[PDB]
């Protein structure tokens, strides 16, 4: 960073916070600016200004070289807000909130105002998480803020990380103008968890279209506080230059705890659960910078996926209730559904998307509009077998998945259940039915194929379906052949075995087959 004037000396330190005494003359540093403390003649230590007291004293939040900071050291000022390295060159790398790269480009302001009323536009472009549960019932649009809430070990990170991994299959094929560049912010997490996500992103080719913001638990509260702000700054570059972006904050709960530490240590009056007055304002100005811009300013986007940990399914906590009131609905992950079997454990009743219908694709809007009617009647009738009861139960079996599904492979398996192709098929054999639909194909296997274009091995039909939809004169008759061949052959040849196999070493072989089918969609 760029020094200018020697504003004062270091007076007191209290871990990662300090206060200064002004130098002779009393220059007075500007508010919210970076200041460099001379720890040695050669080295500096950055810090942010948080309090400008009447005395002339200046409150500092320490950032770098905290062990090397001492009382009586000289303090140089920048007279500027925090700028960081941003661009396409930062992708595929791990970086601090201050901008330094972690071993394993024009700048932009971290403290920036959000787009105003006429700057934004209604969210129309879809953002595929790659989950049949989410993309139908709780659909995320580009520029939307969709919360992820739930307990520890409910799949909050995995559903956020797999959403970034789901973009690679599209991003590779599509024009780079419409590619979803991701920004995973890791606030207060364990260090090895960031390494495992780095390897997991690298193995699925995600690092090409992703940059990892990182402020681990070892690193101070100053960095954790500022980490989501640095994450959005990197996304806003793509937004303001007419491209679409994704921002995951994992998680805002640990950011708030870091901000509470800073506020309490600098004698800011605490309120509810010991947090300061402006802990709502902390998350509000962060999440509002995520938006969908107008045609007049490129039509770019920053989609936000803030994660917020709840303690024993308690939504009444102050930090959780704040973030719910800011975001455009949530994706609630229930602990009982996780242990029960459903993974991802998406509680559809508790979850909600405030801009769902307009966000979805034309094809996905066709099937999903009916699913709301079926699952509404299924949930009611389950408490108190109809056609809704049969077809409703199969949807629940289909929603279970480990890795994210491709848009073609998802929508066809849901369309089958909608029109009632899995009615004669039992509930336990839905994943075996879905596996044989996607990877294999029964019409081409046995004999009775004779489709001119529509097959499941041809992955390129994905984008034709998105244009025309399934309910359309081009694909309707050709699709209903594929499914009729698949059902009749599966019921006759494949499901006949299950009435038979009632012996040791065949019942176990059936189980191990069906359990592996839950993973691959």
């Amino acid at each position: 960073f760029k020094t200018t004037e020697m504003i004062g000396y270091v007076h007191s330190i209290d871990g990662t916070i300090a206060t200064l005494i002004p130098a002779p003359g009393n220059p007075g540093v500007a508010y919210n600016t970076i200041i460099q403390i001379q720890v040695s003649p050669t080295t500096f230590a950055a810090g942010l200004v948080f309090n400008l007291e009447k005395d002339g004293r200046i409150g500092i939040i320490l950032m770098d070289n905290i062990t090397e900071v001492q009382s009586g050291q000289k303090v140089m000022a920048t007279g500027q807000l925090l700028h960081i390295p941003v661009g396409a060159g930062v992708l595929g790398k791990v970086v601090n909130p201050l901008g330094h790269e972690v071993p394993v480009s024009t700048l932009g302001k971290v403290d920036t105002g959000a787009p105003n009323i006429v700057s934004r536009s209604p969210v129309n472009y879809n953002l595929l998480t790659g989950f049949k549960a989410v993309d139908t019932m709780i659909p995320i649009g580009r520029g939307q803020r969709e919360l992820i809430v739930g307990d520890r070990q409910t799949g909050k990170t995995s559903i956020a990380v797999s959403t970034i991994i789901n973009q690679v299959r599209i991003n590779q094929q599509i024009l780079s103008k419409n590619a979803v560049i991701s920004i995973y912010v890791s606030i207060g997490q364990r260090c090895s968890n960031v390494a495992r996500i780095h390897r997991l992103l690298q193995s699925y080719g995600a690092l090409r279209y992703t940059t990892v913001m990182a402020a681990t638990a070892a690193e101070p509260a100053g960095l954790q506080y500022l980490a989501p702000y640095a994450g959005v700054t990197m996304g806003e570059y793509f937004m303001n230059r007419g491209r679409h972006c994704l921002c995951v904050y994992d998680d805002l709960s640990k950011q708030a705890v870091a901000y509470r530490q800073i506020s309490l240590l600098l004698r800011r009056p605490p309120g509810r659960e010991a947090y300061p007055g402006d802990v709502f304002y902390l998350h509000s100005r962060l999440l509002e910078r995520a938006a969908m811009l107008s045609p007049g300013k490129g039509g770019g986007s920053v989609t936000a996926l803030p994660i917020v940990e709840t303690l024993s399914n308690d939504v009444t906590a102050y930090i959780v209730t704040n973030v719910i009131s800011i975001t455009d609905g949530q994706i609630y992950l229930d602990t009982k559904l996780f242990t029960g079997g459903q993974r991802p454990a998406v509680n559809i009743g508790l979850s909600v998307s405030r801009v769902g219908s307009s966000a979805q694709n034309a094809a996905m809007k066709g099937v999903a509009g009916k699913l709301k009617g079926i699952l509404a009647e299924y949930r009611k009738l389950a408490a108190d077998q109809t056609i809704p009861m049969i077809r409703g139960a199969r949807f629940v079996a289909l929603f279970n998945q480990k890795q994210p599904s491709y848009f073609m492979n998802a929508i066809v398996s849901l369309y089958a259940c909608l029109n009632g192709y899995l009615d004669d098929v039992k509930v336990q054999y839905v994943k075996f039915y879905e596996y044989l639909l996607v990877h294999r194909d029964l019409g081409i296997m046995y004999g009775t194929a004779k489709n001119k274009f529509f097959y499941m091995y041809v992955q390129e039909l994905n984008y034709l379906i998105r244009f025309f939809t399934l309910n359309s004169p081009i694909l309707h008759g050709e699709l209903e052949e594929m499914l009729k061949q698949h059902t009749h052959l599966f019921l006759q040849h494949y499901q006949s075995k299950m009435n038979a196999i009632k012996s040791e070493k065949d019942v176990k072989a059936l189980k191990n087959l069906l359990y592996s089918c839950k993973r691959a969609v």
Binding site: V118, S121, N124, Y125, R169, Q172, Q173, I174, L175, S176, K177, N178, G205, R241, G242, R243, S294, P295, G296, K297, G298, G299, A362, H439, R440, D441, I444, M445, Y446, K452, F453, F454, Y455, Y457, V458, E460, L461, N462, Y463, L464, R466, F467, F468, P473, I474, L475, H493, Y494, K497, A509, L513, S516
Partner: protein
């Protein structure tokens, strides 16, 4: 004629300068970078601009010096159609879908070609010719040479496989 965006501000209809940028294309990912730069300077893509982009997707190789994994000129092409139809609200003319038919026969993906001639015959009528026989040639080429489809589908194994 004059035009206004969704709010009612003035919009730059001057398309022709940005068209000649797309003609100097070389690799087709550069065309998208231009399409970004028009929107940034309050100039929405014209119906002719999309067709000029579609031309560049057909002619050039893919990304740049290096190849990307799973390139698919068709998938990049069909995404651009989805953008103009649904979001920007523009019906693609006869020129639009003719560029799509060319890429099916050029790359050899005949199965797509069968689906899109059905589309071209029903939606935008035009003249369903020249490429229909070239597409049907590639269909017979797969049959006579060896076999159609891949070998994972043919297998006939069944039972407890994977």
């Amino acid at each position: 004629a004059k035009k206004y965006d969704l709010f009612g501000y003035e919009v730059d209809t001057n398309t022709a300068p940005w068209i000649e940028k797309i003609k100097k294309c070389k690799y087709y990912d550069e065309a998208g970078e231009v399409l970004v730069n028009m929107n940034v300077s309050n100039c929405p893509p014209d119906i002719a601009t999309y067709n000029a982009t579609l031309q560049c997707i057909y002619q050039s190789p893919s990304k740049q010096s290096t190849p990307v994994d799973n390139e698919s000129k068709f998938c990049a092409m069909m995404d651009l159609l989805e953008e103009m139809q649904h979001r920007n609200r523009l019906k693609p003319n006869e020129e639009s879908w003719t560029w799509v038919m060319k890429e099916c026969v050029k790359s050899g993906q005949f199965r797509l070609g069968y689906c899109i001639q059905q589309v071209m015959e029903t939606e935008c009528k035009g003249c369903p010719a020249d490429l229909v026989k070239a597409n049907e040639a590639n269909a017979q080429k797969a049959k006579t040479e060896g076999k159609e489809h891949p070998g994972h589908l043919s297998q006939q194994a069944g039972l407890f496989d994977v």
